[PDB]
């Protein structure tokens, strides 16, 4: 019989989670940069 | 309660200064003219929250 509680979900900093962390962060920064660019664009249009 | 009350008062004071600075720096630009340097000098100087 198995001698381990059947817990399979990995933990952050793992290779599998690190890669999604890497990809997720890059997209978030890209989205954040777009947000900042749009905010500045709408900004300079108002005042 | 004392620490929380002090924390709020400083926040309220800080918010109070920010609005006052907005009034002092926004009134001169907006007396006769509508002209506020479209966020080039609206950010560095004071609150650019003027509608314009």
What tokens appear for B17 in the block? 């200064």
Chain center to CA of A28: 5
- Rounded distance, CA A42 to CA B52, Å? 12
- Pair B46, B40: CB distance under 8 Å: no
- Rounded distance, CA B11 to CA A37, Å? 30
What tokens appear for B43 in the block? 């950010």
- Minimal Cα distance from B40: which residue of A? A44
CA angle centred on B22, ends A44 and B7, rounded to 5°: 115
A1 vs B: CB within 8 A: no
Q: Measured between alpha carbons, how far is residue A40 from residues B9, B42, B46, B47 in Å?
A: 32, 12, 16, 14
Count of CB pairs separated by less than 8 Å, A with B: 23
- Pair B10, A15: CB distance under 8 Å: no
Task: Return the SS3 of B36.
Answer: coil
Q: Measured between alpha carbons, how far is residue B26 from residues A42, A46, B19 in Å?
A: 20, 15, 10
| Technique of determination | cryo-EM
A40 vs B: CB within 8 A: yes
Residues 6+ apart with CB under 8 A from A43: B38, B39, B42, B43, B48
């Amino acid at each position: 019989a198995a001698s381990h509680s059947n817990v399979v979900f990995p933990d952050m900093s793992g290779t599998a989670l690190s890669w999604v962390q890497k990809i997720s962060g890059g997209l978030g920064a890209f989205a954040i940069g777009a947000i900042l660019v749009l905010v500045v664009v709408t900004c300079i249009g108002l005042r | 309660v004392g620490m929380s009350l002090l924390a709020l008062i400083s926040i309220f004071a800080s918010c109070y200064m920010l609005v006052a600075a907005r009034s002092k720096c926004l009134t001169p630009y907006a007396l006769t003219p509508g002209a506020a340097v479209p966020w080039t000098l609206g950010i560095l100087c004071c609150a650019p929250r003027a509608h314009a």
